[PDB]
Amino acid sequence: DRGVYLSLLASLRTRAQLPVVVFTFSRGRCDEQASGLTSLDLTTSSEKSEIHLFLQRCLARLRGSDRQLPQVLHMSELLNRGLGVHHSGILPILKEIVE
Amino acid sequence: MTNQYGILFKQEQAHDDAIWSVAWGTNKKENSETVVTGSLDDLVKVWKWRDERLDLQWSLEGHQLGVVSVDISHTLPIAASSSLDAHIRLWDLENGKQIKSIDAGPVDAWTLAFSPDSQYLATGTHVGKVNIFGVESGKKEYSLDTRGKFILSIAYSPDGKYLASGAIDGIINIFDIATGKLLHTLEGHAMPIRSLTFSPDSQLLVTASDDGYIKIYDVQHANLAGTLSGHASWVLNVAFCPDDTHFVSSSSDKSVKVWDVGTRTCVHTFFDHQDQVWGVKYNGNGSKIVSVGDDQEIHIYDCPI
Amino acid sequence: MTNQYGILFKQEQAHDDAIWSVAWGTNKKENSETVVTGSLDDLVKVWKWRDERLDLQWSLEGHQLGVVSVDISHTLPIAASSSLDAHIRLWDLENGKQIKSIDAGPVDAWTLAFSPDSQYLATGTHVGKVNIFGVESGKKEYSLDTRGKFILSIAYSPDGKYLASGAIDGIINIFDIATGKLLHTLEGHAMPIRSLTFSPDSQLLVTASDDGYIKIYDVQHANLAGTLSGHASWVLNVAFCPDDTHFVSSSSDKSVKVWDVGTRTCVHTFFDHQDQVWGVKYNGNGSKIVSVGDDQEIHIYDCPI
Amino acid sequence: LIAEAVGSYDTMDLFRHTTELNMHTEGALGYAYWVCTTLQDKSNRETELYQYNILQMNAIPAAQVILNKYVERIQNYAPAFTMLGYLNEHLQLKKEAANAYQRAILLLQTAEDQDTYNVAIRNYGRLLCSTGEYDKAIQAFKSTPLEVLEDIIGFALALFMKGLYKESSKAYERALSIVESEQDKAHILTALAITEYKQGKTDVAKTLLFKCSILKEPTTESLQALCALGLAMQDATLSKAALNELLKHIKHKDSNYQRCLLTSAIYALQGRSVAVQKQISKAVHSNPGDPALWSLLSRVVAQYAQRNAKGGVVAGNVAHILDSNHGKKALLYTAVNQLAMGSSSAEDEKNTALKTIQKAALLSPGDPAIWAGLMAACHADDKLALVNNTQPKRIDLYLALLSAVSASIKDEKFFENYNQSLEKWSLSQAVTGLIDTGRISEAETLCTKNLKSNPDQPAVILLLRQVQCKPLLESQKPLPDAVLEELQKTVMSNSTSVPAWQWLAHVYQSQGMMRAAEMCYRKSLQLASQRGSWSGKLSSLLRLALLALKVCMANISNDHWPSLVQEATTEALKLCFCPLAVLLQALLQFKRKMGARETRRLLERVVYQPGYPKSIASTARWYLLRHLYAKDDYELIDVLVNNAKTHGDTRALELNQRLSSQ
Amino acid sequence: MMETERLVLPPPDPLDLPLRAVELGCTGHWELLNLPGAPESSLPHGLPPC
Amino acid sequence: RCIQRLAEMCRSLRGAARLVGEPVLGAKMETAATLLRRDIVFAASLYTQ
């Protein structure tokens, strides 16, 4: 499946069919390929800057320990490249950022 | 069934040390939204809440020691501050430059309060009196006298005709500006008061003493309507809502609660500070809260109308 | 010929005032058997067991208030001492030259205990933290944190991945060093603890109480497999011997009792130390016993294996 | 009501619910009655009925508000007033309780005339006596049959408060007549001892307290009074016995702070003055909680044996951390300890003396100590900034602070000696500060106004002398022996004060009387050493050494000043590790027989060993650079250049630049 | 009181530095100021009575 | 999600304990609710304000 998704996204980025919504059917399967994909970088420099500005302005309200815990960091790393997850095992504050 | 409460902004380090007082004034007729805060320094930094965030505007300073109370006025662009330095120098808030300087030591002033029409700037002395200066017009026209102890809190009813003064050891004195004669003295609490506030329409006086209770007295008689007890340490400031339905109280237990006076109960508590909270205020049409704390931070909350 | 426990030594004036901590390290296999004591002065004194007696080597100092706990490390010859101002010193124990002076905040450290490989030097904290300062290389390496009251006494496991920590309220918490996940919480008593000791091949944990009781617990569970009711007054420190046969206990009623695990009865009691005893220890084998009392007398008893 | 009639267990909760709904009158009275009845029973305070309900639902304040509304509504019923008075008494709102009892008295006159009216009278009189107005209390206690223990005791205490000690003694004796519950007999005996003592006549107090001691079981009250009586006397022999007796067989006392204070005071009586701190350290080791003990340790280390400044600062901080309402005293003591320390820190902001003293001043702006601490903090900050040489600040506020100190003292009940000392010290410090800043006229007028109040006291006149003689001797001038003699006479007037003597010797040095200045310094050193003080001794010693070295500096003959320097420096090194003293020895060696080897070795070791102040290191560095230039070694000179570079310097390298190309 | 006078050369050497002794606190801590002037002790009258 | 669905029941029981006549459940349910909601568990929504 790792080669299947990198071949699908390789044939999809060559065209303009980029904003692709993968539907997985179980949250472990949902997070597995998002962890295993691990190198696309589908985002330019200015969009990286805008993503970082928006995500830091929205994330900087809450306190210190609450903004450094595994999901927050891992999801921010994924979003920087331009990949997101939206299953039911994530904090409600991150579903809203992804949407 | 309660409203949607939550933070809107969080300044990381406003000053270098504790912040001891805060005043929020939407003074000008246009959209100004000026916040003036004073700390354990000489700095009296003047922030502005512009659209979604606080942008520093002035960093004016002329003091020698820490400022213990600051104030702003709703009619003119002006501010006043007093400190342990024995000076009540009042700034300009437009050019960030000092206007005046009044000499008065810890035996002549502790805390500031402007007039409803921004003319008189009353302060509480050490020997028991309340000294009323004159802004833009000199010094010390007259002082009301109550034969008591050190006086901490000074308040004005926002229609004139009433002045209230709490004291160390608890007793409360209510004067009327019309004649300057003591109407009646409440006996209140058993520990220092250090905060008082009237309500809009000036018929409900809310105290907050040092033992944790919050009496809610009633003006024009001595009837009290109940005691709000929900804190776990001292209470250091009380700010009453523009509409006579809620008020906010900040305690030394690192938590700023918001009560409502109809049923005398606490709707929502904010657990966001990490040290003593020395100052809370509302804004104009009350829908946002400022809370400056002993740890160097300025919190702005969101209390929907 | 039965070899009965004999007094076998007395040192009349070891220190100038009360004595509070005693450590015996048979670190050097040669004739060193260094014993180090801390005695409510700046002075902490190193003694060596030469043939049958204590001959002073050096007394070294620098401490603001009285010293509370000292420890000697097995791996390297090195000592550690903490005082009432929460300030920790490391002694070379070869020249008396104060290799390092680990500082600490107003509330950082109360008592001390080394890691089995002489690496960690675990210590309690007035507000519940169990922060650990790596020896000779690092400062505030990390802090295991819990929610609770004062933490008087610290135990530590010989093999590893266990750390039992008594508290003033009277509860025992044991933390495995592997990850920091509290293994299980032992309710314990309703009075302070003051001492926690493991065993070689650490399978049994002994807790001392402020009610006079002594509790034996099994580390793999919370089995309160014992209860001892011989001491009249408080119990201050309890230590084992290199075999799991019997332990010594040090009451505050001027009596040191030697209890045994096999029958759970007091085989012997000693009568010296007009003032209460604050420390007890066993040498490199079961032979010799060290007791340091509130009175300025060091006692060395004998108890063949 | 039905639940109450059939005697159930959840009637109190039902009344509480009724109180919470809408404030009807009948429920109001029912709830107040139940709260008062629950408070009476003293076997409750572990039950989780008393603890949870009363102390976690704030039952008492709710009952008070309820009764206020009821009483204003009805206002012709006496038990409501008495219940209101009782609850107010538990809230320590004494004035309102007095008003409630007064109204109850008015209601109950012409209906019953029985015990109820008398009980209301005794309660009103007792409470009135509790808060001033003693004459009214006596008058109220007149209008009752003085035939029960309560009324007689209340009368006796009111009489004692107003004065009239003989009357109080007689009243207590009459109350002693009718006594059960021997505990009360012991308490009355202790009260007798206390009240008659204030007349003098201490021996009868002592024997009477022994008579109380002969009772079956001690009471933990008479023993404490006995110890305090011993302390009021001297020669604490019975005091030691009393303390041992108290400790021996009494454990139910649960204060643990009064006992420590008594033990410490006993040790202080013998003038030991170091054991005191050791004993308190033992007590705090025993019970590591109890902030009060930590705070008292900080206070004692600040007062006695002020050489453990670091430990005191830590103890004060710990006392402040473990609670909040001890903020006031703990912050004051840590501020004073930081003042004593000096500047032995990392030059860190937000933790200097000024910051902590300001915090304490904000916490409780009532006591007179904090303001004096503030003046001392301002002066010390000025000197420290001057040493760092950036800017002197906080220039002119001393007069306001002095006015604040005096005004705050005016309202203090009685610590007469302490208040007199505090006011005198504030006056002295304000005058010295004004002299330093440069406001001579204000200092002069202040001194004149103070002297106009009372006939002369030999302290303030010295201050006036100081303000007078500051302008002159500032600019070089020669003074006539008449003025010098008068100043000498004035210092001699008030002796046993090392400052004054040191200042006069400085005056001699300024005009120039070297040997005489040396004699004055020697007298100051002897006085300081005899006092058991420690700072004065070293200060005088180093100052004298400086005097001799500076006078020698001019390359004067009569080579005796170096001998004095040698003796003084040896003594200083004997006491401590004064860096200035060792540098002074090095400078003396360099000046006399400038030489090559011994001087260079001592200077280089001084400027290479760590743990030294910046300024002393710089001075040693500069002199060593000059000596090294004398005995050429360019390598070492470059070594000094790089040593300067790795630090910040302006003058050593600049001189090196000046002298590399002469 | 025996000499009644001292005559000295006040600018003896311009190369060397005058020594200014400033005292900070009661626990021994001295420092050396640069400019010549008065003895300039800190807290001359002693600690404020607590 | 479970904690958010619990803080809405420990506040609807405050409404019934006042109705039955149990003034001791009210003083415990108004504590167990105010002691349960402080942080990112109850962080306010983004597209709400």
Author numbering:
A (entry chain A): 550 to 648
B (entry chain C), C (entry chain D): 1 to 305
D (entry chain B): 903 to 1564
E (entry chain A): 1 to 50
F (entry chain A): 1198 to 1246
Give verbatim excerpts from the published study on this entry.
The superkiller (SKI) complex is the cytoplasmic co-factor and regulator of the RNA-degrading exosome. In human cells, the SKI complex functions mainly in co-translational surveillance-decay pathways, and its malfunction is linked to a severe congenital disorder, the trichohepatoenteric syndrome. SKIV2L activity has now been shown to act primarily in exosome-mediated degradation during co-translational mRNA surveillance pathways (Tuck et al., 2020) by extracting mRNA from stalled 80S ribosomes (Zinoviev et al., 2020). For clarity, we will refer to the human orthologs of the yeast Ski complex subunits as hSKI2 (SKIV2L, ∼137.8 kDa), hSKI3 (TTC37, ∼175.5 kDa) and hSKI8 (WDR61, ∼33.6 kDa).
Two-dimensional (2D) classifications of the cryo-EM images revealed the presence of two major subsets of particles. The subset with fewer particles (∼40%) resulted in a reconstruction to a global resolution of ∼3.7 Å and showed interpretable density for the majority of the complex. We will refer to this reconstruction as the “closed state” of hSKI. The quality of the cryo-EM density map of the closed-state reconstruction enabled us to build most of the atomic model de novo, with two exceptions. First, there was no ordered density for hSKI3N (predicted to contain TPRs 1–8); the N-terminal arm of hSKI3 was thus left unmodeled. Second, the density for the hSKI2arch domain displayed a local resolution of 4–12 Å in focused refinement; therefore, this domain was built by docking a model generated via a structural prediction based on the yeast ortholog (Halbach et al., 2012; Tunyasuvunakool et al., 2021). We will start by describing the closed-state conformation of hSKI, which is generally similar to that observed in the structure of the Saccharomyces cerevisiae ortholog (Halbach et al., 2013). hSKI is scaffolded around its largest subunit, the TPR-containing protein hSKI3. The hSKI2arch insertion instead protrudes from the top surface of the hSKI2cat domain, extending into solvent with a curved structure.
